[PDB]
Each structure stands twice: as C-alpha cells, then as structure tokens.
C-alpha cells in the first residue's frame, strides 16, 4: 500500500506522426496518429495526450522504439520482443502483413537476449548481446544486408557480421547503418544521396565498412530519413546523405558521399544524436540540445519556421539541461534533467501530447509525463 512515486522518463521515441514513451514503474504510453495502429491501444483513434499502453502493463518492458507508423518494444525479464502497427511488407516480423491494433509477441525473438532494436520506415533490426544482428521487413534496396532484395516477413540472421560484434544499428526510410563495438562503421541498402558514407550513390545488399572516417573510430549512428549522422571516440560529429534541406548542417544544402565532420560543434562533446525525416538534433555532454534542417512545421525548435542549416541550440526554461532527445518525421521530442519531457513541431495528429492539435516551433512542455506541468 506504498505511494507510488514520480515515474521517471526513461525513453522516448518518436515516428512519422507518433510518440511513444517508457517510464519506470513499467509503463508504456503512447500518443499521436493512431489510424494505423501504431499506438497499441486497440482500436484506430489518435490520441492528442499520452496515453497508458495497457496491453504491455505488466510486461517489464525495457525499451521502445518507433517506426515510421509502427512500435516495437521489448522486454530483457521476459525475453520477448513486441510489436505493433501498420504490417505492410513484413516490418512486424509475424510472418505476414497483417497490421496489428495491439502488440503481438515477435516468436521468432523469444529466448533472445536484446541489446538493441531499430526502426526505418518499414524494416527493423535486433543486436542481441553477443552483438548479433537480425533483420526484418522491407528489403526492396537491400536494407535488411541479407544479400539480395526479397522482403522478409520473419527476423533474419545478418550472416555478413559473422565473427563482427555489433554494438548498435540504425534505419531510415530504406538504409541501415551499424557500429561495431571496436568503432568501425558500416552501411548498406539504398544509396541515391550518399547516405551510406561508401563514396558513392549505388546501393549495397550486405554490410560494407566506411572507410573514411577521420582515421577514428565511431561510437554511435543514428539515420534520418535520406541521411545519417555518426559520433566518433572524441565527440566530434559526422554527417553524410542528403541535405536539400541542411539537414546535414554544415552551413550549405551539399550532399556528402563520406562522413563529413560539422565543425561548427567542434567545441562540443556530442552524446545523443537523433535524425528526423529533413531535421537533426545533437546532445551535447553538458546538456546543450542543438537542431537543424528543415523548419517549416517549427521542428528545430527554435521559435521560428525558418530553416536552419547550421546547428542552433533549442533553449528550454531556466536552462535546464537536456538528457534524451528523440526525432520524429516533422517533430521532436526531448526530455530533461527535471523529469520534463517536451515536445515541438508538426501537431496535427497529436504527436506533441499537449492536447491540443496544433503546431508549435519551440519546446512545449507534455503535462501529463512532466513534474513542471
């Protein structure tokens, strides 16, 4: 008969025109579009407030992550990986392309030791502890590194990585990348805008290693849409792929074929990176958020709709420090020292969880999850 206390914001996750997010106590919630069945709750209503996932109460889940419009979330108690949403292509990893409205056990995951999960637009990958990869869903470019462009309706096996331990993975709309836990980094699927980091415009099937890295090593990836971002050993940050939008940030609309290092951060140890569907966020170590790219729905959160194509630092009230930052499609999340979380860009299907479905271009803060709301 305790009081229960204050849950803390664990992760947060965002996708085309969804926000999800993990609290302690073993609470998922969900809000934002709802129509495609991304947001578990049963039924196809969008939900312009977070939301309580009751499906997974109980599951101990330890993270979520968002596709473009479907979850995924797994639980290291239970052994068992969760997904949910639009089907199409097989991205659910069930075997067919049936959408889901609820989350349904990914079998072919059950017994696996999680490390890792991430979500492109309709194909996901699974590190397991021993640094293992699995992938899943669409493969129409070679996304999924299995070798050729067969979609796969169930995890597969990245045979490629046999004898490679892979720290962590990351996926756009049809490109993968990965680190590997002694800093290589590598790249595969759709190669139109650079987006690889292999020099080229030409796709890839399996993994392939970026070798043009600054001679150092890489310790995280993130994707975008059409483009990536790499953080290195020393903080020094890495885009490449498309910039029509600056999305790259290096202060021009340039694409870049290798890792470029934005130097305008050169000062700032990068700790978080996250990459929206035209926009950027960096985390600095000191907690400083910085944004850039597109604007037009006012997701780089600096109070204006203008784009940005060098970083600008989003401010948060009193200063407070910023300790996770996740991007969706055309917004943004981010939570802070304080146990705020915030939200800010495109609102029409309720992704900001401020109740109201409207857009806004600076932090918001999410009353339902914060302490200051």
Same mark, same amino acid.
């Given at each position: 008969g305790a009081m229960a206390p204050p849950r803390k914001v664990l992760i947060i996750s965002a996708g085309a025109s969804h926000s999800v997010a993990l609290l302690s106590g073993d609470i998922v919630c969900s809000w934002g579009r709802g129509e495609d069945g991304?947001?578990?709750?049963?039924?196809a209503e969008d939900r312009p407030s977070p939301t309580q996932?009751? @499906?997974?109460?109980?599951?101990? *889940?330890?993270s979520v992550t968002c596709g473009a419009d479907h979850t995924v979330a797994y639980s290291q108690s239970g052994m068992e990986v969760y997904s949910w949403g639009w089907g199409n292509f097989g991205r659910?990893?069930?075997?067919?392309?049936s959408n889901l409205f609820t989350p349904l056990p990914i079998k072919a995951l059950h017994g696996i030791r999680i490390k890792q999960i991430a979500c492109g637009d309709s194909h996901c990958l699974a590190v397991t502890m021993e640094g293992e990869v699995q992938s899943w869903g669409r493969?129409?470019?070679?996304?999924?590194?299995?070798?050729?462009?067969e979609d796969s309706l169930v995890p597969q096996k *990245?045979? @490629?990585?046999?004898?490679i331990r892979i720290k962590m993975v990351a996926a756009g709309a049809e490109h993968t990348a990965a680190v590997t836990e002694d800093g290589d980094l590598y790249g595969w699927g759709w190669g139109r805008y650079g987006?690889?980091?292999?020099?080229?415009?030409t796709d890839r099937l399996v993994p392939e290693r970026?070798?043009?890295?600054?001679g150092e090593k890489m310790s995280m990836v993130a994707c975008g849409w059409r483009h990536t971002i790499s953080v290195s050993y020393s903080g020094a940050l890495y885009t490449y792929g498309?910039?029509?939008?600056?999305?790259?940030?290096?202060?021009?609309l340039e694409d870049h074929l290798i890792p470029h290092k934005? #130097? @305008?951060?050169?000062?700032s140890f990068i700790s978080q990176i996250s990459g929206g569907w035209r926009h950027t966020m960096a985390l600095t170590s000191d907690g400083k958020l910085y944004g850039w790219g597109? +604007?037009?729905?006012?997701?780089?959160?600096?109070? +204006?709709?203008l784009d940005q194509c060098s970083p600008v630092q989003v401010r948060f009230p009193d200063d407070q420090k910023v300790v996770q930052v996740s991007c969706g499609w055309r917004h943004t999340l981010a939570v802070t020292e304080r146990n705020n979380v915030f939200a800010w860009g495109?609102?029409?299907?309720?992704?900001?969880? *401020?109740? #109201?479905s409207v857009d806004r271009n600076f932090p918001k803060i999410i009353e339902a999850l914060s302490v200051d709301g």
């Open positions: 991304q947001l578990g709750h049963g039924d996932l009751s @499906a997974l109460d109980g599951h101990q *889940i330890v659910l990893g069930h075997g067919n392309s493969n129409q470019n070679g996304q999924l590194g299995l070798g050729d462009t *990245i045979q @490629a990585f046999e004898g987006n690889l980091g292999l020099g080229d415009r970026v070798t043009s890295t600054g498309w910039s029509k939008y600056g999305q790259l940030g290096h202060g021009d934005l #130097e @305008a951060l050169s000062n597109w +604007n037009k729905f006012g997701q780089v959160g600096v109070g +204006n709709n495109r609102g029409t299907n309720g992704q900001l969880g *401020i109740g #109201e």
